[PDB]
């Protein structure tokens, strides 16, 4: 009846999945597409005890096992379709003229999305609507806005990362949380970690939330505690066993761990809308202190950040509070950590976009604003990746089809701010396209971006803490 979204979304995704793979025409050491191809290559030609040791200077495996296994499966299938593509040590830099193997990879991304991202968010919106007894048209719109989140759609297709999988897995975790299937929620979580360690950002929530709910909230229940301890440890064991047993043993476990969390290098070498990338340009941390002081200050900052949310979670676990506190903790992590790159913002964008289902107007307005901002702060990467056009294509599309031509909150303060930032974004897009930097320090516009994003995200996270504290009024939870 409504499945039209289920197909126009996929059409949109595949239409974007025609752009340039990252690092196109990058002779020495190609972009990310080459990394994925290379991991799929070397996973199907070496024993299990030699996936992490093979070539640690050329895109050596970097993610937890599940990435390895998934890439191994896809490599098997691609070999079946054609083995000449995965020539070990020979097809290192494959560039076909007829666009072979590109449509293949894009199909892989699409299928992974469809399997692990679509149904989660769809069923979740179904659940919320069902509970709040809203018009089916409303729920259809509340799903079609989500699935067209521009940032994620762009970064998966074209830039070629599988963020969708881990995102959808944590979505399944949240769902299972709603329907109280806690023992399955923990397992969906531990699955989401093992695909990309980057999804540890929500652990400070799920820890306290499961703790309070099972152990403490209704009563001092005990059974479910051993239940979840059983389940999570079981997940870790069954996902790491092929390494220890079928491989070098504890040596390979230690190598895997220290290869997931490599030691820090350099200081503030990447321009991201972090907290230090901004204040580094005034205070010049490089000289003020050593490196260990900064790695301790960043840790203390992140802990101070996500602590109040954890305390409030342990204090008042309620289903109508999750997206707020997930945003609190995810943003606390992405705002103060030491080495963050240009993405990861998607990982806060999960519990942001999960809010479309809300009934208030301010929240929807804010969420659309912040999604536009996030889409913006990724422009440098895209620009230096091709995608001259698809940026604005999706930029337009998403804002149009969400009903932006009739729009802003009911408060001039917020209105003034939103419009000002929109001007700024429009403004900046000139100062690079035709203006050259003062040449006294050329890479300025990018630092202007590192800056203009920070204000937005900071005020957003503050409003998230706000919405936490102002709410908790035992509101109907039908919100």
């Amino acid at each position, epitope marked *: 009846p409504e499945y039209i979204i289920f197909v126009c979304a996929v059409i949109l995704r595949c239409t974007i999945g025609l752009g340039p793979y990252s690092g196109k025409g990058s002779p020495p050491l190609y972009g990310d597409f080459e990394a994925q191809r290379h991991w799929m290559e070397i996973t199907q030609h070496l024993p299990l005890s030699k996936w992490y*040791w093979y070539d*640690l*200077q050329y895109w*050596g495996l970097d993610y937890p096992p599940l990435t390895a296994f998934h890439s191994y499966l896809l490599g098997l299938i691609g070999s079946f379709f054609n083995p000449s593509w995965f020539a070990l040590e020979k097809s290192r830099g494959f560039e076909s003229p007829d666009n072979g193997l590109k449509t293949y990879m894009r199909s892989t991304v699409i299928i992974s999305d469809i399997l692990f991202y679509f149904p989660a968010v769809i069923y979740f919106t179904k659940w919320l609507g069902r509970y709040r007894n809203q018009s089916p048209i409303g729920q259809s719109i509340a799903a079609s806005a989500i699935l067209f989140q521009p940032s994620l759609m762009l970064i998966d297709h074209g830039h070629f990362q599988y963020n969708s999988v881990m995102l959808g897995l944590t979505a399944y975790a949240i769902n299972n949380l709603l329907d109280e299937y806690y023992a399955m929620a923990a397992v969906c979580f531990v699955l989401s970690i093992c695909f990309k360690q980057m999804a540890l950002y929500y652990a400070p929530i799920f820890f306290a939330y499961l703790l309070s709910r099972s152990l403490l909230f209704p009563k001092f229940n005990i059974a479910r505690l051993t239940v979840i301890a059983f389940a999570t440890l079981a997940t870790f064991a069954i996902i790491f066993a092929p390494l220890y047993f079928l491989g070098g043993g504890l*040596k390979n476990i*230690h*190598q895997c761990i*220290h*290869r997931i969390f*490599p*030691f*820090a*290098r*350099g*200081i503030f070498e990447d321009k991201v809308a972090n907290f230090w990338c901004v204040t580094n340009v005034f205070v010049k941390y*490089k*000289e003020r202190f*050593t*490196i*260990q*002081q900064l*790695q*301790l200050y960043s840790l203390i900052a992140t802990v101070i950040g996500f602590l109040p949310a954890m305390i409030m979670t342990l204090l008042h676990p309620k289903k109508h509070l999750l997206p707020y506190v997930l945003i609190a903790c995810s943003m606390s992590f992405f705002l103060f950590s030491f080495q963050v790159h240009e993405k990861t913002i998607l990982i806060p964008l999960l519990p942001i976009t999960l809010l479309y289902s809300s009934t208030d107007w301010n929240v929807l307005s804010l969420v659309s604003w912040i999604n536009n901002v996030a889409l913006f702060t990724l422009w440098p990467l895209l620009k230096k990746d091709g995608l001259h056009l698809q940026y604005a294509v999706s930029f337009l599309l998403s804002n149009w089809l969400i009903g932006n031509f009739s729009l802003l909150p009911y408060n001039v303060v917020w209105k003034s701010f939103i419009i000002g930032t929109y001007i700024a974004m429009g403004f900046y897009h000139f100062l690079d396209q035709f203006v050259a930097p003062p040449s006294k320090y050329p890479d300025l516009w990018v630092l202007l971006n590192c800056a203009v994003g920070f204000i937005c995200f900071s005020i957003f996270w503050l409003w998230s803490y706000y919405k936490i504290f102002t709410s908790g009024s035992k509101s109907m939870k039908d919100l």
Partner: antibody
Amino acid sequence: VQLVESGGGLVQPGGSLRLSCAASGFNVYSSSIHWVRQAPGKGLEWVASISSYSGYTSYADSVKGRFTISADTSKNTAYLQMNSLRAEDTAVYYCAREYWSWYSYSYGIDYWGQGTLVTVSS
Amino acid sequence: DIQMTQSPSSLSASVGDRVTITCRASQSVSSAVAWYQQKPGKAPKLLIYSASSLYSGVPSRFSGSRSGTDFTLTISSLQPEDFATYYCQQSYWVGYPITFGQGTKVEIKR
């Protein structure tokens, strides 16, 4: 808990060598081998290194290209290949372990090889 | 780029005396500086690491410190069996080249 060196003797300029360093009872994939050379009657001087987790060779600004470090944890071995061997490269060479940890917290250069002689002459 | 200036070139002091060696850094972006001792012929032996931690296996008459960019080592009760050459050694972080001092030789005063 005691390194050993091997490979050392006269080599004419333009020659080549490959010094080997074998460990004893400590993994060599968690130690970040260095090769510290000492010229005769002069002070210590670092040459090449490794990170043991991400193959981050870093060669001193005098040995760009002419040398090449390598490791192998299959047998707790570390190698230093040498290709040019100008006349002044004559020295003593030690392999040296250094155990980092979390938060870039060094632990210094615990274990030193006993030291090999290298004489570059014609 | 990276180096350290070890001062002074050469001291002399008889037993019981207390003496101090300085090591002016170049850019204070790391606090991992070790102090080594070398007898003639042998291979150097670690004394102090992380700029203040005395190694386990060394008499406690040694004491290090950091002063902004001017690391410092002190020996309180200089014994006669402590005459060797002492080396300041800095390492920035994992994949970054390290650098040694220029050499400091204690010897007897007479």
